[PDB]
Amino acid sequence: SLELGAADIQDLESFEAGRGALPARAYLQSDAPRLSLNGEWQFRLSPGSRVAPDDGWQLGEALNGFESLPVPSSWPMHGHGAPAYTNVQFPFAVEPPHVPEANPIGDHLVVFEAGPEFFPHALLRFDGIESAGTVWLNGVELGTTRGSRLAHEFDVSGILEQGENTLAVRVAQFSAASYVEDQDMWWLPGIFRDVTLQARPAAGIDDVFVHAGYDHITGEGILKVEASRGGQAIDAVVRVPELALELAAGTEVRVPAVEPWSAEVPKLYEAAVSAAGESVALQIGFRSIAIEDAQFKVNGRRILLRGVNRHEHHPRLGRVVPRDVVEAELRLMKQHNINAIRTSHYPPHPQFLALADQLGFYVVLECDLETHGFESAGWAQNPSDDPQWEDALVDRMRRTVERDKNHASVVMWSLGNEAGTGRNLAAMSRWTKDRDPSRPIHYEGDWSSEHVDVYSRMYASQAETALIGQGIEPALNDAALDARRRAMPFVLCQYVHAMGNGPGGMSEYQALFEKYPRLMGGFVWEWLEHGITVSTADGVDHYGYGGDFGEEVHDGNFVTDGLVDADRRPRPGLLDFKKVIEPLRIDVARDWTGFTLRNGQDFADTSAFSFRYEVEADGGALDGGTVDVAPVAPQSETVVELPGSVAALAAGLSDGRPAVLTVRAVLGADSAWADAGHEVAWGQSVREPGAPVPPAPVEPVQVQDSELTLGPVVFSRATGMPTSIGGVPVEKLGLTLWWAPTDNDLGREWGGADERPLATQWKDAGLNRLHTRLLGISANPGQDGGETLTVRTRVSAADKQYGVLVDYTWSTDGETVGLRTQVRRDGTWVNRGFEVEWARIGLEFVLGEETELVSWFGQGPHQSYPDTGQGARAGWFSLPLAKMDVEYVRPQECGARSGSRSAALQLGGRTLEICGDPFALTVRPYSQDVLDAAAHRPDLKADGRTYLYVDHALRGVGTAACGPGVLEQYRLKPRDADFILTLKVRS
Amino acid sequence: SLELGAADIQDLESFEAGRGALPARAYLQSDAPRLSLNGEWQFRLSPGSRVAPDDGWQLGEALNGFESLPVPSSWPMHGHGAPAYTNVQFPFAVEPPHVPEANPIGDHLVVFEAGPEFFPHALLRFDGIESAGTVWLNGVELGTTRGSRLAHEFDVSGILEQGENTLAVRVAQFSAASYVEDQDMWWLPGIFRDVTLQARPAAGIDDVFVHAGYDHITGEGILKVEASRGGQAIDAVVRVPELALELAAGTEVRVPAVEPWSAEVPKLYEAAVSAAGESVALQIGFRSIAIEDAQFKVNGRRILLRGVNRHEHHPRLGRVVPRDVVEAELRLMKQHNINAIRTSHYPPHPQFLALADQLGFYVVLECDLETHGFESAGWAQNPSDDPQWEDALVDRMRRTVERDKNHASVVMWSLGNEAGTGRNLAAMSRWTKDRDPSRPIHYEGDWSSEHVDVYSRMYASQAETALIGQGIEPALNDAALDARRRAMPFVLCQYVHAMGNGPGGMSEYQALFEKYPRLMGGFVWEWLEHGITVSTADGVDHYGYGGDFGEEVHDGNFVTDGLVDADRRPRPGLLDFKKVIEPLRIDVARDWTGFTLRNGQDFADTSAFSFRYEVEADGGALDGGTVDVAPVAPQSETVVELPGSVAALAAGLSDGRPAVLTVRAVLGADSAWADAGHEVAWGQSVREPGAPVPPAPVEPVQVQDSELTLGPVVFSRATGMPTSIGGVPVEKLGLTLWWAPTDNDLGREWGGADERPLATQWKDAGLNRLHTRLLGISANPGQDGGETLTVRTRVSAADKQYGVLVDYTWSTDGETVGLRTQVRRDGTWVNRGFEVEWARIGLEFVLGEETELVSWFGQGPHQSYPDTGQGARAGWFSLPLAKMDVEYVRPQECGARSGSRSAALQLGGRTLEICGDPFALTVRPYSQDVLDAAAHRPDLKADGRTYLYVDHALRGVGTAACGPGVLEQYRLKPRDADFILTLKVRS
Ligand SMILES: OC[C@H]1O[C@@H](O)[C@H](O)[C@@H](O)[C@H]1O
Ligand SMILES: OC[C@H]1O[C@@H](O)[C@H](O)[C@@H](O)[C@H]1O
Ligand SMILES: OC[C@H]1O[C@@H](O)[C@H](O)[C@@H](O)[C@H]1O
Ligand SMILES: OC[C@H]1O[C@@H](O)[C@H](O)[C@@H](O)[C@H]1O
Ligand code: NA
Ligand code: NA
Ligand code: NA
Ligand code: NA
Ligand code: NA
Ligand code: NA
Ligand code: NA
Ligand code: NA
Ligand code: NA
Ligand code: NA
């Protein structure tokens, strides 16, 4: 046997869970001496095991080819190799347990000093290594690590020396473990979490298991704190000063009156567990979880999960998320009404749990297991059902549970994600149920739900969710399993996929969640986009995605699919989600005399809120103030009278004059996660402006050689289009039926014989390449000598027989311009045997000047489409042109403001005003073809023009990239239509 | 009605065949004064009718914005606008008869002088205007033209002035006529054929209709020459000096003994038809066409059509083909055994016919009609069935027939191409049959063949052609139509689509054509690639295709689909076609004592040929000479003894020594189309070399730290691959299963539930991204202390479970290296539910040095794949590296030499020799990924390496871009395989 590297590769191809580590235990804050070894290490990268040197480097002499690297790190984020993104597909041939030849091997080394406090006994702790580590201390092999987001500890007693020590870690990117770590995220090798030296004093505490239940009938806590050393129960004293408790470890007691823990009221009691040589600090939250009557209950009450799936990602540091970023993003979640987190799809940093305990989230804590890439071969060779993987998979679940078992915020254990079905998942479940019966088990991969306590699905349609909510879903074939599952509460562990413009359809899910007790709620996919910061030539920063790093196989921008960008800037979808899940419902009376208030919280009353009202009209705020609301109990509702001045305004206002009454619930005092005045919920009553009044057509049409003039409008006799309106240059006016496809429009709509993405249906139909033919121009009798001008056109596409006849009828009294647009189908809009859907029925004005400011009356300030925009409230808004856009990583249709009644564009010295029955408003400095063609934001370029879109109809955006497409009521099928606009130019 | 251009557009949207022209007539050479107005004209381009100026330009004063342009021209070939390519799809919305707003309008003007010989009567002739012309002379509108490849004449009597005249022509690119001119070719507006002034003397001859039949029983000609003036029969004298004839026009006579016209013997008699004021010169070919017993017969004999479809294209002049290019390309056709031409899909230049008469081609003369783009809407609005188009379509057929009716070479009239079915096609057929019953009618669009005389199909499979050949195809539903069609002879008006690497499957068609009398033969699609010369930045010329000129809709390189490139350089497919259709069959005896000779001609014996033999061995030609063959009658065969020295050589040669006997039929004397010695047919008998002798494995394996040495081979212990062989640096050695897709591999294979193109099946399966894992390296006992080296690998692709185990076993005696390769499937090669086919089973050697020369024993000199290479004969060949490639416009797999037994690559100072059982040999200066990625030839770049491909198996190339894919016997399904090679390096 003559090839090199055979021994290294045999270890990497091992089915075992690594070797030499201490037993799995909790992460515990203790008074034992601790030394962080984080800092600047030395690093050397080789392309595979067979050429990785065996040159004595572990002794830190002859450091040929090492350079400085921070640890913790995801090494490709610091110029060593490159990040690589795949969703489902493995980036290596699928032949477990074998590894590819191209397998980055990273050799890490650090020299440190240990004082006498680390003797005689100490350990080394590694909180994460992707994917396989071998650890040496002073040349002595301690062992190996498997389970990339799991902790490993190694005893260094007798190996650690007083004074200088040399720690060496060889890390392989790929190993047999990669076959069970196929999460949809970047592949990023490294020592990416803390490395810590911990003294282990005699008579200490190795592990602690807190049991802190709550009896909602009596108000009592039920407390038992187990403590062990070396795997044996030990005498320790547990002290809980706030509850006046001093008790022995290992004894169960009843605490007469505790305040229970929930995400809404995350009450924690400080406790210490003390042995003669070591003391552990704990935060204890008393809460009990029960499944009863097909409901998921905490402390005796059904809860509603308002969740997100949280990955660990940083755009410049990879899997290393700095603590201040964690703290800020959790506050941002609370500020957007989120109360639940799924740790997709692996345990988080160990210090994450205390923050979730403190700030208050219901946490689904998920084991590091996903074998999704085996699905394409019908799950042949799936690790989850292969006996050779049993010890490895049970070890993952054991380490997951042991680390985090003391945290009140963890309300469910999850076995993993998209790992199919099989005997090893059943083993993991059995192990967990035996070890910790206090928490229900979650796993979506096995729909029969045989080895779980809740029924979990991902992206089940609103329709199917409604059936499950009513308990009337189709039965399993096994009647015993059906009876069990039909009696389980139901959770969407992932739903309303938040990629790009979207997600649509959130309100239809939320109405079900709030109506049906069996529906626990849902976790959006996902919290964050995994953008990675890159720069073009000339150094414009932007986010990159799959394929931007030279990957042979990748999944493009499917990793940029979140509610916030990688720097935690909200996408519009987060603003809408906040409103959809708001925990108070405020229904303002149409006569402005009061509002109905529903408290949708599970435990807290409304005493934390201040209730504010404001009345706004075109001239500004007319009135505002606070109203005193007696605290409303959870799940209750009341009517609140508004002060009489508000109704008096409603009475006085002229008919047709717009006015907006807004009632808001804000924090009355600072919380841990937001300041006093932070808005939690709102409701509105709107007095809509009257429909626009088209002008009297008293101005005649003036005929020149090549132009026509009608009041302030000049028209080309060659095209029938205006060339200027009140001095504003017009380069083009035409009908629009299409938009630059969203990420959702690039997804297939499963169901229906046509499974082309909508973007492809549009391209096949020519909707992205429409052309206009002029049929005629004629003047007609107006009023008092005036005339109207009718321009008749037909819109179609090359090689197609279907079209729409579009008639524009222009009128003017010299100041206001009336524009009537009439659209009539000419031939059936069917292509390749399927009906052609439209994006919109609208007009595109291309103006020959740049727009500085856009103002409108409608919804805002952010974008809104028919099935989104919940967070866009009624009002008057004004934005610089640049802020009308949405900085999605792949540019796509975005920025429409649906429900507009009036708009004003400032174009230098003139203002173009537009009024209509509800229309969508979009304004861009580049064309739709530039938007569509652009793959990254630097591809967008302003051309000195204004592209103004006025839509009479729009389709929704749905979630077709993953899950339901646009629901029927928001789809736009071809139809005939007519609509009126008025236009005015002020100088 | 206020829009501009309404009158111009109404004329362009007219269904009528234009106006003001003289009656259609023949193109006739006459002694009447003629003046060509070709030369430098003045030209002005406008973007559409509505802005085209009406500024008096037709009077040639105030020439604001005109510049010089040659006429004839296709104006986009001279920098005015751009060529645009579509295949089927129309480049404008389909709403006949309406035209798009973007419609290039070209205003042409020339001033010329007319002498007194053009008075009192003269006409102006236009032999082609694409697509709509309006003609003025001295400001007087003469009329308009429709039918872009048809002639129009206008009477200028009373309008032409003695002295200076001003001719003005406004030409619109698009008109209602564009809907009936949807040929797959470039859209190219212009005045693209001759413009001629012709005097019309009193007592002249306006039209002539030659009727020249042949009675094959008596050998007599049957002659009647009709002559008219002003639509009335006239007294004229017909003189045919060579036949001693002086006869009256309008009288039918029997000529006692003529020599009949055929493509093989294109006998023409010079004749003159004379009235008092004008004389016409004619070339008369006596031939009669008959359909009898389901056979297409000329002069009493069934013929075999060896055809091509000929478009008119020039890479720099567009639809203008210079006469010297026409003459040369026709000679090139004859030089490649072609005897028939279809004028796809419009009449050719009027002077083309005399050349076809003279050089000898059977011509299918096709009317300018194609409505293919209506098929996508189920032929809704198809002009061919719309009564409004009847006069326009009958006018096209009338002008087609009248122009060319006197030419012996025209043996069938065709109504058009891909125009569906309908009443107007039936009218065209009825008109033609009434006017000229001497020629059968062709039209493939109506398979029922109700209004035609032959059954025509395009790209019918070899299988279906065999059924039709035997008269056993499925019946039509109408038994009367079935009886008629089953009694028709059958022609493939298009077959073996010649796009890119290919066409495969030609031999299977040819065997049928020669076996079954009902099969008339076939016309390849097509003669030429319509490449257009363009240049990159830095000025490297290359051909462009669809999309290279900014087209919104286009069909890419589907216009580069010919046997020759646009400059008439042969593609390999033409060299193979020449051999497939060779009109003599030479079958050399295996004992080299003689050959069987079949004369496959229809009329001529073999007396025109000299029969040559040559014997070649490794050292060169051993013997050669001529053999006297008594002339063999058409459709007969004989055995010819070879001189005894040839057999004596066969006897003397050592067993296993390679030797090639070639017998060739060459022209014994110059012809009109080639020189004496031009090769027409050949046959060979080959004494194959013995299989290679692997060396005795007497050399041991030497083990170094990171390398192994086995005789002259050095191996990496990290990869198992050789790093040098006899000092030749080796960068990579690995298995190949894939090739850079051909144009055919990009086509769908209709039939079978999998209609992905093969290229897509390969991409989905990862065949374009294979990776290799090393399993082990070990030495084994050899002979006399020597050892063999076995390297075990596995080849697969990321995210796939299927692989192939590949074992390489190396041996050496210090000079020769033996390489045994064993391939074993590991898992089923099925992806997406369908079996994955392979391109090949071979090896890729990447050498670290450039190759100057490639020599081999096998077939050549050009490329050969399993279902091609008919023209590649056995022999020894040697080419510079650059000449191994094939300059297809879109680079793709090409250049393999199948059937190789030995190869030698000169790499500077060393020669690498390879021997094997038959293998395919390819050598390139760039990798397969560069080849695949390249869209035009300048994308290819040499990287300083040599890419050497040795294939044990290859698949065929088929014709899947249009018509049959690879036939079953040439497909390469996954299998297990083993093969031996020997390698030697000479310095
Ligand atoms: O973004 C697509 C998503 O699809 C789900 O099936 C998966 O569980 C998620 O991890 C993510 O990949
Ligand atoms: O102010 C009410 C709060 O209720 C919590 O349960 C939630 O996590 C917060 O996001 C906020 O909605
Ligand atoms: O190259 C594809 C070919 O397809 C045929 O159907 C057509 O008759 C030809 O003109 C050419 O378009
Ligand atoms: O030399 C025989 C010749 O026969 C003709 O019919 C044919 O057009 C030529 O290409 C050549 O084959
Ligand atoms: Na619920
Ligand atoms: Na994703
Ligand atoms: Na209050
Ligand atoms: Na809204
Ligand atoms: Na885009
Ligand atoms: Na035949
Ligand atoms: Na073509
Ligand atoms: Na002879
Ligand atoms: Na051959
Ligand atoms: Na290519």
Tab-separated table of N, CA, C and O in Angstrom, chain A residues 679-725:
chain	number	residue	atom	x	y	z
A	679	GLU	N	-43.191	51.060	19.426
A	679	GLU	CA	-44.526	50.693	18.971
A	679	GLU	C	-44.666	49.183	18.863
A	679	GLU	O	-43.868	48.535	18.184
A	680	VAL	N	-45.706	48.640	19.494
A	680	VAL	CA	-45.994	47.206	19.449
A	680	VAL	C	-47.173	46.881	18.540
A	680	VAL	O	-47.132	45.890	17.798
A	681	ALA	N	-48.222	47.712	18.552
A	681	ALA	CA	-49.390	47.437	17.728
A	681	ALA	C	-50.050	48.752	17.338
A	681	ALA	O	-49.843	49.778	17.985
A	682	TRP	N	-50.908	48.690	16.323
A	682	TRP	CA	-51.607	49.884	15.856
A	682	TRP	C	-52.837	49.482	15.048
A	682	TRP	O	-52.931	48.361	14.538
A	683	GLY	N	-53.783	50.414	14.954
A	683	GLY	CA	-54.933	50.259	14.083
A	683	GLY	C	-55.329	51.627	13.577
A	683	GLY	O	-54.985	52.648	14.182
A	684	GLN	N	-56.067	51.645	12.467
A	684	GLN	CA	-56.386	52.907	11.818
A	684	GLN	C	-57.824	52.908	11.330
A	684	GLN	O	-58.414	51.862	11.045
A	685	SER	N	-58.383	54.116	11.245
A	685	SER	CA	-59.590	54.378	10.485
A	685	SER	C	-59.300	55.525	9.519
A	685	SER	O	-58.785	56.571	9.933
A	686	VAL	N	-59.624	55.323	8.242
A	686	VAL	CA	-59.226	56.230	7.170
A	686	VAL	C	-60.464	56.831	6.523
A	686	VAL	O	-61.370	56.101	6.107
A	687	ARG	N	-60.490	58.161	6.430
A	687	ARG	CA	-61.454	58.876	5.600
A	687	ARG	C	-60.773	59.103	4.261
A	687	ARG	O	-59.851	59.922	4.167
A	688	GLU	N	-61.197	58.339	3.237
A	688	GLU	CA	-60.533	58.310	1.944
A	688	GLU	C	-60.880	59.560	1.143
A	688	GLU	O	-61.996	60.078	1.247
A	689	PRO	N	-59.952	60.061	0.334
A	689	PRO	CA	-60.286	61.185	-0.538
A	689	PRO	C	-61.227	60.745	-1.642
A	689	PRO	O	-61.259	59.578	-2.038
A	690	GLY	N	-62.013	61.701	-2.129
A	690	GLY	CA	-62.896	61.428	-3.244
A	690	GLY	C	-62.135	61.053	-4.500
A	690	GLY	O	-60.963	61.382	-4.681
A	691	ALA	N	-62.826	60.332	-5.379
A	691	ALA	CA	-62.254	59.999	-6.669
A	691	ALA	C	-61.861	61.281	-7.407
A	691	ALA	O	-62.424	62.355	-7.160
A	692	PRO	N	-60.881	61.202	-8.295
A	692	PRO	CA	-60.430	62.407	-8.991
A	692	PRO	C	-61.490	62.921	-9.950
A	692	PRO	O	-62.309	62.165	-10.480
A	693	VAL	N	-61.477	64.234	-10.153
A	693	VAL	CA	-62.435	64.909	-11.026
A	693	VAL	C	-61.727	65.196	-12.350
A	693	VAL	O	-60.846	66.068	-12.388
A	694	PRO	N	-62.046	64.488	-13.431
A	694	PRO	CA	-61.410	64.801	-14.703
A	694	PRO	C	-61.794	66.198	-15.141
A	694	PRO	O	-62.923	66.658	-14.887
A	695	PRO	N	-60.890	66.913	-15.792
A	695	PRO	CA	-61.176	68.306	-16.119
A	695	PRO	C	-62.214	68.421	-17.224
A	695	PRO	O	-62.450	67.498	-18.005
A	696	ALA	N	-62.846	69.583	-17.278
A	696	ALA	CA	-63.695	69.903	-18.418
A	696	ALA	C	-62.835	69.982	-19.673
A	696	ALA	O	-61.815	70.681	-19.670
A	697	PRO	N	-63.202	69.296	-20.761
A	697	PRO	CA	-62.338	69.293	-21.953
A	697	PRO	C	-62.607	70.506	-22.835
A	697	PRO	O	-63.140	70.434	-23.948
A	698	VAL	N	-62.241	71.670	-22.305
A	698	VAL	CA	-62.536	72.938	-22.960
A	698	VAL	C	-61.366	73.427	-23.788
A	698	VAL	O	-61.511	74.407	-24.527
A	699	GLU	N	-60.231	72.761	-23.721
A	699	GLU	CA	-59.102	73.162	-24.544
A	699	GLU	C	-59.109	72.369	-25.857
A	699	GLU	O	-59.365	71.162	-25.841
A	700	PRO	N	-58.887	73.000	-27.015
A	700	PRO	CA	-58.869	72.267	-28.282
A	700	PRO	C	-57.495	71.671	-28.567
A	700	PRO	O	-56.499	71.992	-27.913
A	701	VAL	N	-57.466	70.779	-29.558
A	701	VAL	CA	-56.226	70.192	-30.051
A	701	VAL	C	-55.661	71.105	-31.132
A	701	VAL	O	-56.371	71.483	-32.071
A	702	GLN	N	-54.404	71.506	-30.972
A	702	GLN	CA	-53.691	72.301	-31.969
A	702	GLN	C	-52.807	71.383	-32.796
A	702	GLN	O	-52.034	70.593	-32.240
A	703	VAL	N	-52.913	71.486	-34.119
A	703	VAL	CA	-52.211	70.585	-35.028
A	703	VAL	C	-51.027	71.319	-35.638
A	703	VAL	O	-51.195	72.353	-36.297
A	704	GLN	N	-49.833	70.781	-35.422
A	704	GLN	CA	-48.623	71.210	-36.105
A	704	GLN	C	-48.179	70.119	-37.075
A	704	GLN	O	-48.761	69.026	-37.138
A	705	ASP	N	-47.126	70.421	-37.841
A	705	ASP	CA	-46.629	69.474	-38.836
A	705	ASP	C	-46.391	68.096	-38.236
A	705	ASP	O	-46.838	67.082	-38.785
A	706	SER	N	-45.626	68.035	-37.152
A	706	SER	CA	-45.227	66.759	-36.572
A	706	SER	C	-45.676	66.587	-35.135
A	706	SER	O	-45.405	65.540	-34.541
A	707	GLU	N	-46.348	67.574	-34.564
A	707	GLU	CA	-46.745	67.555	-33.170
A	707	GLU	C	-48.195	67.979	-33.062
A	707	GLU	O	-48.730	68.679	-33.929
A	708	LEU	N	-48.808	67.561	-31.968
A	708	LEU	CA	-50.091	68.076	-31.528
A	708	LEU	C	-49.912	68.691	-30.152
A	708	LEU	O	-49.093	68.224	-29.348
A	709	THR	N	-50.686	69.736	-29.880
A	709	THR	CA	-50.716	70.357	-28.561
A	709	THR	C	-52.143	70.342	-28.043
A	709	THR	O	-53.082	70.720	-28.759
A	710	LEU	N	-52.302	69.912	-26.800
A	710	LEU	CA	-53.588	69.932	-26.114
A	710	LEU	C	-53.307	70.520	-24.738
A	710	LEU	O	-52.783	69.825	-23.866
A	711	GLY	N	-53.610	71.804	-24.560
A	711	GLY	CA	-53.274	72.469	-23.324
A	711	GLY	C	-51.793	72.335	-23.019
A	711	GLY	O	-50.943	72.698	-23.837
A	712	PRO	N	-51.445	71.809	-21.847
A	712	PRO	CA	-50.030	71.667	-21.489
A	712	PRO	C	-49.346	70.412	-22.014
A	712	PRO	O	-48.187	70.185	-21.659
A	713	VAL	N	-49.984	69.595	-22.857
A	713	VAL	CA	-49.390	68.347	-23.334
A	713	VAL	C	-49.027	68.516	-24.797
A	713	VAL	O	-49.828	69.024	-25.588
A	714	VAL	N	-47.828	68.073	-25.156
A	714	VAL	CA	-47.394	67.991	-26.545
A	714	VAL	C	-47.276	66.519	-26.897
A	714	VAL	O	-46.782	65.725	-26.081
A	715	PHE	N	-47.761	66.153	-28.083
A	715	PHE	CA	-47.766	64.774	-28.557
A	715	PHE	C	-46.987	64.670	-29.857
A	715	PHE	O	-47.014	65.579	-30.684
A	716	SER	N	-46.329	63.528	-30.053
A	716	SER	CA	-45.753	63.197	-31.349
A	716	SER	C	-46.839	62.666	-32.281
A	716	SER	O	-47.594	61.768	-31.901
A	717	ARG	N	-46.917	63.209	-33.508
A	717	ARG	CA	-47.817	62.633	-34.503
A	717	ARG	C	-47.280	61.325	-35.083
A	717	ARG	O	-48.001	60.638	-35.817
A	718	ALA	N	-46.036	60.968	-34.775
A	718	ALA	CA	-45.456	59.718	-35.248
A	718	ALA	C	-45.724	58.558	-34.306
A	718	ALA	O	-45.767	57.405	-34.754
A	719	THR	N	-45.868	58.826	-33.010
A	719	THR	CA	-46.032	57.766	-32.019
A	719	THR	C	-47.333	57.842	-31.253
A	719	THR	O	-47.700	56.858	-30.607
A	720	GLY	N	-48.017	58.978	-31.276
A	720	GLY	CA	-49.181	59.191	-30.452
A	720	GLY	C	-48.871	59.416	-28.988
A	720	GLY	O	-49.805	59.636	-28.206
A	721	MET	N	-47.561	59.369	-28.581
A	721	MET	CA	-47.243	59.509	-27.167
A	721	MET	C	-46.966	60.970	-26.843
A	721	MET	O	-46.513	61.726	-27.710
A	722	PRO	N	-47.205	61.376	-25.604
A	722	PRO	CA	-46.783	62.716	-25.199
A	722	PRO	C	-45.268	62.793	-25.267
A	722	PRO	O	-44.569	61.818	-24.970
A	723	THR	N	-44.769	63.961	-25.672
A	723	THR	CA	-43.347	64.274	-25.617
A	723	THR	C	-43.006	65.282	-24.526
A	723	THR	O	-41.826	65.449	-24.204
A	724	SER	N	-44.002	65.951	-23.957
A	724	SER	CA	-43.807	66.808	-22.799
A	724	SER	C	-45.165	67.031	-22.166
A	724	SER	O	-46.188	67.039	-22.855
A	725	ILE	N	-45.169	67.174	-20.842
A	725	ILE	CA	-46.377	67.472	-20.096
A	725	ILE	C	-46.019	68.639	-19.191
A	725	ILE	O	-45.228	68.478	-18.256
